[PDB]
Design a protein around this ligand. Structure first.
Ligand SMILES: [Ca+2]
Ligand SMILES: [Ca+2]
Lengths: 462, 463
């Protein structure tokens, strides 16, 4: 069984037509959804980039790993400072880790990483962690020199001037498939396809931008207040600047990026079938964190889930998830059991038939039963973000268990309890109406924190 | 507060952009949803028309009223017959029901019915049930003579040649709004606006249809297979015909009908604001049963909810629900607690400060705690549809409780159990895996059935 893991950057939970978008159009991804299972309660294990990507590669929670913030490679930003100081974090995937690429490669797989990496400098590139190929992956968190050739990526040779990064990365993925077919498909492959989309700057071809300016016109959206200024930011480096929340999906350039992305998923999936590998490829479409909605241009909206990237509220942790596996997963099905990033590692091992290495810690759970149509025992899901981020949040930790969600904020020690079944949008803090429910979820969160050795932000005495 | 209850016909749970549509465009309704509470687990109390509309007006489950099938005013088709015989039902709203129109009128409201009625002949028109006005409601369940003027609708005077009925029904609602303003708004109004949209036949202006042929071609959907033939029907009158399921949302004419419906909703709410009534009007958008996905043209698809109109599966009972009440409902929020059609009666009465009459049964439960952001105690939700219907189902009854749904099928007494949390699309019957859970749900359904005096289909001994 091949694994094709399509990992979007910063794609919010309502950023697909098939997961609830009111403006964006994603016909090729919609088809994939029709051919597989979609997950309504799909989470990333962190509200920003590198920790969720480290959690994916290791099947571990970010705090057990030590990578709990997005990696600022040249220390010009972290640690951020407010009333608290950002906690320190390991600025790369820790060296001793045994990744899913290593496990699968040890079990006979071809392992390819394509696209965004963001897990350290050259000593911690994909090749040191079980990957045979690295096309376009480096230490950058986004296209530092834009989406148009030249890109500046040391592991991606430049294309003709005017080449679009998202198109080229797809070509690179299509090239690996056809190459493998030419050599006889000796081994099952494992592709970690990490798009640079849809991270800022939102740079798109003009035909794709204009498409959705016309639609926003004929739809009336051009006349609707999309951005709304809110509170002041919380760190010294943004003193004076206010949080700008986007309250409606209407951004035409952002829609164009997603339209272009959808054509590329079309190209990619058509190559996979042209290689006679559709029947036996597990296809996963997901994202590393929630949509960007509260700063840096606010290209998208995640309402009725609150806020977005950088926040521990639902809008920042929720994420689309489609899984297709012909013959095994029922097409056009849906599952509502909470699923999180560290779950894929043991899922893939179970689908490959490969035992776990003794003694490595695994915080995730194989979702193979859900992919079959069966419930599983209730388990909590956790977050621990002891940083501010750039988007408006403040350091916090979180547990979801059943219908309830507990959040504690490190600035003032306060807790917030939500009944997400009755109150999906987190409008009604019921901490004090249910002290008992709060105390259980608070203690559960603290015990997990002790077990994974979480670090906490220290007060700022300046 | 005023009540603008917008009651669509046969609109599936995924037929709006703001509730998961992949093709349809509903800007004016998306804005409504951005201004209120959307309900992710919204249910109609019956998979076909008349029982749910009777259940909405009286706050009782259809099996208690006796109206358990859509009303067939000629003896053309009911009772349908296969292995079993359709059960008898009352073909009108029963005489002594104290409906929410009466309850609010007696509390000083002005009451208006506009549009589809389908609750009996002349002696059971809205005026016999507490409404002061009835524009366009008769015994018809759909535009017998089409959506383009003339309509032959006994309570709607014909419009100029080519007038579109949904445009016209909206114009009548706007008129009532402006008349009340001219008169100085002496009383709060309760408006029961029942569109005939989106019932077959799917007739639309060509500019609307052509806009979504264009869209289907730019998205590639025009060259996909959208309709799939299936099992045979189950009744003598459709012997030889096969269920035809729609598997994608791609029908341009239906898309065009929802697009016109969206313009008119925009006109109506604009008029609501132009009369300065926006801030103190409870606005509800919902529908009477699930979308038509399996017969009679299969205009929409309800997937991942299986099947549609006329089945007790999720696609037949799930329905969109948005509630807007400025200053009271948080704008752009979302509740996942199951709500069902008979809840509106006690919700509206509580919102208006009116006590419910003594000694009248009410199976519904006010949802104002949910409109406030508060949870309520867990309750089961029930269905009793002892008829075949036209869309390919078989007589069945149903209870949803927490994460579990149990279905009993009258043809053979087989039971079906689904974990709707793990298995939303009802893929995996776990009745034999969790026997105690099944027996508990079965006995609760049977006890409810006893208490409401539900009737059961008879075996057709000639089969
Ligand atoms: Ca990211
Ligand atoms: Ca109906």
């Amino acid at each position: 069984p091949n694994f094709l893991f399509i990992f979007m950057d910063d794609m919010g939970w309502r950023d697909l037509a098939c997961t609830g978008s009111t403006f964006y159009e994603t016909p090729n991804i919609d088809r994939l959804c029709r051919q597989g299972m979609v997950f309504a309660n799909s989470y990333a294990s962190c509200p920003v980039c590198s920790p969720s990507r480290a959690s994916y590669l290791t099947g571990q929670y970010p705090a057990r790993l030590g990578v709990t913030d997005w990696i600022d490679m040249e220390g010009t930003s972290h640690p951020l400072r407010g009333k608290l100081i950002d906690a320190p974090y390991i600025k790369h995937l820790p060296e001793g880790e045994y990744t899913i690429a290593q496990a699968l490669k040890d079990a006979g797989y071809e392992t390819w990483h394509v696209g965004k990496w963001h897990l350290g400098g050259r000593e911690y590139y994909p090749d040191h962690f079980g990957f045979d190929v690295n096309i376009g992956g480096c230490s950058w968190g986004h296209p530092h020199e834009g989406y148009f050739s030249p890109y500046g990526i040391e592991t991606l040779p430049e294309g003709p001037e005017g080449e679009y990064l998202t198109d080229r990365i797809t070509d690179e993925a299509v090239r690996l498939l056809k190459e493998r077919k030419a050599g006889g498909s000796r081994k099952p492959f494992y592709m970690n396809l990490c798009h640079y989309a849809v991270h800022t700057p939102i740079q798109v071809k003009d035909e794709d931008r204009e498409r959705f300016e016309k639609k926003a016109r004929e739809q009336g959206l051009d006349q609707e207040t999309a951005l709304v200024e809110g509170e002041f930011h919380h760190t010294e480096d943004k003193k004076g600047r206010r949080v700008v929340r986007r309250v409606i999906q209407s951004d035409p350039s952002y829609a164009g990026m997603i339209w272009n992305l959808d054509q590329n998923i079309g190209r990619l999936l058509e190559a996979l079938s042209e290689c006679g590998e559709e029947e036996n490829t597990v296809v996963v479409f997901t994202s590393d964190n929630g949509g960007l909605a509260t700063s840096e241009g606010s290209p998208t909206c995640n309402l009725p889930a609150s806020e977005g990237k950088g926040w521990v509220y639902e809008g920042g942790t929720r994420v689309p998830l489609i899984v297709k596996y012909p013959g095994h997963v029922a097409p056009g099905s849906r599952c509502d059991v909470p699923v999180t990033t560290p779950d894929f590692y043991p899922t893939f091992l179970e689908l490959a038939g490969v035992p776990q290495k003794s003694g490595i810690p695994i915080d995730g759970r194989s979702i193979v039963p859900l992919l079959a149509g069966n419930h599983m025992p209730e388990r909590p899901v956790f977050w621990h973000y002891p940083h501010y981020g750039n988007q408006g949040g403040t350091p916090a930790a979180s547990v979801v268990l059943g219908d309830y969600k507990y959040i504690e904020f490190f600035e003032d020690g306060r807790g917030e309890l939500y009944d997400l079944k009755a109150d999906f949008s987190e409008t009604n803090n019921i901490c004090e109406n249910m002290p008992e429910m709060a105390a259980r979820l608070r203690m559960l969160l603290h015990g997990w924190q002790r077990e994974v050795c979480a670090r906490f932000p220290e007060v700022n005495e300046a």
